[PDB]
Nucleic acid binder design. Sequence first.
RNA 1: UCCCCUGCUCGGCGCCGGCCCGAAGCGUUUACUUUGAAAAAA
RNA 2: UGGUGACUCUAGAUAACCUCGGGCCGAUCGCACGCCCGGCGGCGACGACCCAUUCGAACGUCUGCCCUAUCAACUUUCGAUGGUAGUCGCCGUGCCUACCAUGGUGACCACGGGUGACGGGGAAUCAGGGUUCGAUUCCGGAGAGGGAGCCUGAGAAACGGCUACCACAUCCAAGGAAGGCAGCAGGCGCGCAAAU
RNA 3: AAACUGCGAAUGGCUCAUUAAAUCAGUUAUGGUUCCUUUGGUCGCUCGACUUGGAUAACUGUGGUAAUUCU
Lengths: 185, 37, 124, 262
Amino acid sequence: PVARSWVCRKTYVTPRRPFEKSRLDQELKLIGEYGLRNKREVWRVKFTLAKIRKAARELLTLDEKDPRRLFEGNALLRRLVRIGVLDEGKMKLDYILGLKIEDFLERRLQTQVFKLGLAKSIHHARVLIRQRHIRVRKQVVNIPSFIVRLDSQKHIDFSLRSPYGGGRPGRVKRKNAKKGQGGAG
Amino acid sequence: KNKEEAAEYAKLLAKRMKEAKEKRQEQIAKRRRLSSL
Amino acid sequence: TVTIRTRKFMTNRLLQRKQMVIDVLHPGKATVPKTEIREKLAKMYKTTPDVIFVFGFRTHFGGGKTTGFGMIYDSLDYAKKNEPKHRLARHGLYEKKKTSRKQRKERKNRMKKVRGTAKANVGA
Amino acid sequence: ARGPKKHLKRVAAPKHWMLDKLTGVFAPRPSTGPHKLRECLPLIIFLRNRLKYALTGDEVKKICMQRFIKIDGKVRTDITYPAGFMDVISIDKTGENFRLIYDTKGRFAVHRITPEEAKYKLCKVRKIFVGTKGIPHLVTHDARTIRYPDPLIKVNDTIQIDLETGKITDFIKFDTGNLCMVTGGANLGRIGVITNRERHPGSFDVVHVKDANGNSFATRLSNIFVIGKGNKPWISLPRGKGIRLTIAEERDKRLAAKQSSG
RNA sequence: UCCCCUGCUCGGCGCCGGCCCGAAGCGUUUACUUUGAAAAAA
RNA sequence: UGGUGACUCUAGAUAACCUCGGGCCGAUCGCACGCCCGGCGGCGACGACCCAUUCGAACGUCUGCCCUAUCAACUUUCGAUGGUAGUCGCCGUGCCUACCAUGGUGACCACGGGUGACGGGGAAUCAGGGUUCGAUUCCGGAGAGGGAGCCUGAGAAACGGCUACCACAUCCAAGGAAGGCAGCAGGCGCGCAAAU
RNA sequence: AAACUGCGAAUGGCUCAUUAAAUCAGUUAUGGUUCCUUUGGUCGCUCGACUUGGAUAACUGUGGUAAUUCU
């Protein structure tokens, strides 16, 4: 009798067909356009989209004027509009099913840094995030899969302890400066 | 305290018994009234 | 430039101490040790820097913030009465006998082997 | 097993204690006392997780051994003494009193009271007993034997007793129209007015209680505690008044509070 | 959508001992269907 | 007197009993001190035949367990079914005695056998139904090689308590003495298989 | 310190061998019994010494066994 949790789950589901053609084509297109690392990430986004769609389907098989339906459906709708994948003009239960994987992958921190206008490319954006250069509301983020909210998009800038946003320089600048001081002295 | 509690309960039980007897006499008088009416 | 802001301040007449949560702002440097926190809480709260007992300082990811616990006692007798012994040992007014559990258990069993006055003799 | 149990697990505990899942293996098993195992609140749990006076289990023991905790006008030094429904917790040093009243949900709550309120206690009578020499005896829900009660006290009534003496002050009959409290089950802590009492011989009776806005529910006779004469309670009620508003108005009032606060 | 197509000892809830309503007491029994209670935690 | 849906309930009165292995009705302790002409006082601890309460435990009531007919009838003064009167048990009761009657279950699967069977809350897969697992941290039950018997205690058929049997087994001057890791580490054996 | 006394050692921990209306699960009853401890009551209710008795520990001293938490 030890005091642990033992609560864990998988975040992705492997496809049924191991060697297909068109599925591998759009998976490679998604990886290359969004700058991902492996198929596990796009399978994870597909799995969470499938879970949201499954919940929307089982709530849409139900009848109207049911208080638990209205409650956790409004919970799902406010989550989907606060995460940045839905609009105020489409606050309906059926419009969840019209969503795509582009909408979930467009709120990723990597493409938000790439489209914000402070990274050269999306791979450069992943390198910039991974090397501790940005911050989100006075807090640096070391990872690219930080799915931002609608109310936190306008606060992304360079971190204070970084040579890009004003701070101490890195190691090759200081090493080359010391080499220049040695050569000039 | 046993003597005081016994005396107090005896007085209160006498009051309750008097009230119940008055209620029963009122019911007997009302029974006589409905027998006469 | 290391500032201290307090949080969740609440005092106890029944423990003769004041509990609070310390938020330490130290941007651009390492985690500050606890003794300058003790003198700074002594300076801001107008108290001697020996009844303040702080612990549990965790630094947030990124550097610059540190959240921890700290108490302010009325006097030294109350600080000696209702406290754990390890904080008093950290401040250096309490020390324990340098024996392991194995020696104590073996000595207890060997003392249990005999009876009488020789129980103290076999335990050395 | 071979005897009575002495340990209680954290996950195998009543949920209204509202403990976490990973800080230990064992729960504070309450000592034997006036109240039961499920419907009680130990002094260690209350004084550590409700008032936040202590931090660890040693510090609340050092509080309790300084004779600062008073229960029903008596000093209790037990660290796991069961404090049940409408037990008066008095602190002489800090200077405030508490009454253990259920809220709308199934849990206890911190409800401060005036000292003039903290001199009596409402309790439910259980059975009518006749002693050795024809002397009447009365058994309450907290197992306080009262000698020489009023003859009008019946089985399902309620009485108000004086804490510093131990005598019956005044009583409320159990009839339709009296304000009551539900203690146990799904309906717990709801304040309502009794409207009906169905009779089932050989089994448990069921009553019908109406809320303050037209809502109705039903509980057994053993889960009924009358708190007032008519529509006026005899104690101070906590915030919310036991109305049990459902999740939609809770979400709406939380959104309104977040809008008005920011 | 809304009211209607079961009755013969005490009240009080009203009207003029009486009427009315509410109740001590009861209605050929079942399955099915709807609600409510209780239904450990994880 | 008082209560239950229901007493041979609680209470009342009368006549006695009241176990030398025996019910109670205080030959215990600490602190602060005292008032009033020796006697008279408070706040606590310990113990207490009882009554209620609390943790329970125990025996019952209704319903629900995988496979097998190459298991179709089973049980019975060596109790199986019911009745009466008793012993014993903390109590109800074939739980056990003495006397009676021949009963009781079964094709709606009794009975016998198997299980790589501890049961449940649960887990994997899963359109919709379903299939498989559950030794395993929570709840209940069982055991400490296997049967058996018991002391003490409120509560044990207790095994980090005792007493004898067999199997295994330690020390010895050979007369005797001492044991039970299916607890935590560790070792041997075993196996595809599991840590200081 | 030691020792007498009282209390707890029947809790906790490990395992799944036995067990197929057995265990167990939900619902029920003890009006058919027991209950350490805690809490509350009861404890001059009975019509008849200003403190009693002798035994044993711990301790002192003398021993046996090859050996035991032996005596």
